[PDB]
Amino acid sequence: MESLTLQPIARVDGTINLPGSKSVSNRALLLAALAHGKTVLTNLLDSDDVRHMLNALTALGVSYTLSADRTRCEIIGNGGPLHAEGALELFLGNAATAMRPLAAALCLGSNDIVLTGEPRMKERPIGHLVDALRLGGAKITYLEQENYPPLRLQGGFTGGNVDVDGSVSSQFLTALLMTAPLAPEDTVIRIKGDLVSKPYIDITLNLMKTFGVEIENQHYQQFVVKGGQSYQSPGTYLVEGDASSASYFLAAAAIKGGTVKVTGIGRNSMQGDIRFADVLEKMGATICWGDDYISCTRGELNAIDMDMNHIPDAAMTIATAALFAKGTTTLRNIYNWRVKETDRLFAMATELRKVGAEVEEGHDYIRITPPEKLNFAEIATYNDHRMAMCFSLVALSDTPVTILDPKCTAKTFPDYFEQLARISQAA
Numbered sequence: 143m144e145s146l147t148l149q150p151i152a153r154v155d156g157t158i159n160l161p162g163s164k165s166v167s168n169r170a171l172l173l174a175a176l177a178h179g180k181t182v183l184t185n186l187l188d189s190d191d192v193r194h195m196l197n198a199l200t201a202l203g204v205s206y207t208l209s210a211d212r213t214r215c216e217i218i219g220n221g222g223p224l225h226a227e228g229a230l231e232l233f234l235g236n237a238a239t240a241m242r243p244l245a246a247a248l249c250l251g252s253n254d255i256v257l258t259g260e261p262r263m264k265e266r267p268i269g270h271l272v273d274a275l276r277l278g279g280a281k282i283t284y285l286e287q288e289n290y291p292p293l294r295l296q297g298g299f300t301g302g303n304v305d306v307d308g309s310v311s312s313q314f315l316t317a318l319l320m321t322a323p324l325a326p327e328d329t330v331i332r333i334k335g336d337l338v339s340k341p342y343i344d345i346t347l348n349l350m351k352t353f354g355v356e357i358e359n360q361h362y363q364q365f366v367v368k369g370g371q372s373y374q375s376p377g378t379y380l381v382e383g384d385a386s387s388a389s390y391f392l393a394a395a396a397i398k399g400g401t402v403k404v405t406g407i408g409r410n411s412m413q414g415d416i417r418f419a420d421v422l423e424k425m426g427a428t429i430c431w432g433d434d435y436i437s438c439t440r441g442e443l444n445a446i447d448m449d450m451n452h453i454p455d456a457a458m459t460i461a462t463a464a465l466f467a468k469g470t471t472t473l474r475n476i477y478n479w480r481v482k483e484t485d486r487l488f489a490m491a492t493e494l495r496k497v498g499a500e501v502e503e504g505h506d507y508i509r510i511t512p513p514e515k516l517n518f519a520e521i522a523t524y525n526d527h528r529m530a531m532c533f534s535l536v537a538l539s540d541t542p543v544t545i546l547d548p549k550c551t552a553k554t555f556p557d558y559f560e561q562l563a564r565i566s567q568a569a
């Protein structure tokens with residue numbers, strides 16, 4: 143078991159040029175692959191999740207080249223639905239942004255492809271998406287547990303009236319939205335009830351528009367899609383810096399700055415996680431917005447009690463920042479933390495208690511009361527990049543912290559520790 147021990151960080155200050163957005167990167171790659179023309183993506187993220195998407199595109203026969211640092215990608219669009227037969231297996235690691243979108247996309251036309259991934263991926267739900275694709279005509283088989291990957295896709299999605307559950311993940315609808323335009327018949331996607339992680343739907347629609355396709359969004363309750371469309375290369379496309387990866391650095395400044403500036407995202411960014419900055423401001427930090435940067439300057443840090451459904455990923459960072467806040471912090475409406483890289487409500491509560499906090503692990507919320515002083519702990523990371531990055535912040539105290547399996551950060555941010563070190567100052 144590899145581990146990394148972080149020594150106490152006296153102050154953080156500086157500028158970080160963010161790695162590309164995982165959410166935007168994987169959507170842009172798939173749309174570029176489906177599109178007509180050559181797409182040049184810059185600031186593409188180089189991380190495990192994007193690598194699994196690139197590998198899947200290579201296996202499907204898509205041609206592309208990558209720059210030395212793997213952040214510039216020139217993709218030759220296929221000019222239509224991707225295809226493979228012979229039950230070709232695409233191994234998708236634990237990349238949900240590859241698994242859900244490809245599960246839908248590869249149902250266009252005929253195909254015989256199997257999607258699988260790491261053990262935990264076989265425990266992350268995909269039934270709501272399968273249900274919706276089958277209502278549209280797709281033939282899909284669960285090869286192991288019903289409602290979970292791995293899946294055997296045999297095609298057949300033609301469009302039509304389809305309902306989709308949006309209560310557990312926004313990714314199922316995202317996958318349907320990206321796929322439906324290329325289906326021969328028009329599609330009307332009806333959301334059954336609640337829709338969580340709504341901002342990710344805006345990211346999907348923004349990317350689809352960039353690639354030449356628009357749809358009729360009726361109050362996020364129903365989506366009208368015209369069939370028979372084609373995606374078109376936007377030419378050169380700049381991938382936004384990752385606003386979720388930014389949360390750690392902005393929070394570090396709120397706790398121990400100094401001023402930390404992250405570049406690559408700004409006030410016009412499409413990522414819902416830029417709203418994480420609003421939360422730090424509510425806690426007492428000072429925030430500055432620019433066209434291509436967001437900065438946070440230490441002020442004070444007071445506990446908050448907020449519904450975090452709009453920023454589920456970045457919200458985890460508030461769970462550890464809460465260790466440094468005055469009062470008890472409560473994060474609500476985050477049930478789906480349970481069905482992500484790990485059950486994040488169980489994991490976060492378990493590890494927070496190890497450094498001294500009193501924590502109530504609610505079914506769909508978490509309440510954190512910080513200790514007078516933190517103590518040393520060896521933090522388990524549950525093969526979850528965000529558990530490692532969140533707990534790195536424990537070192538902004540008087541105690542060191544040991545993070546197990548630090549390389550798990552590579553899922554979305556391979557250079558995380560070197561970047562945190564860049565802004566760490568001894569004086």
Ligand SMILES: O=C(O)C1=C[C@@H](OP(=O)(O)O)[C@@H](O)[C@H](O)C1
Pocket residue numbers: 164165166239310311312313316338339342454455478482
């Ligand atoms: O579409 C996306 O890029 C994502 C949507 C979110 O998932 P849910 O919709 O399941 O909350 C988020 O947690 C995940 O890391 C990325």
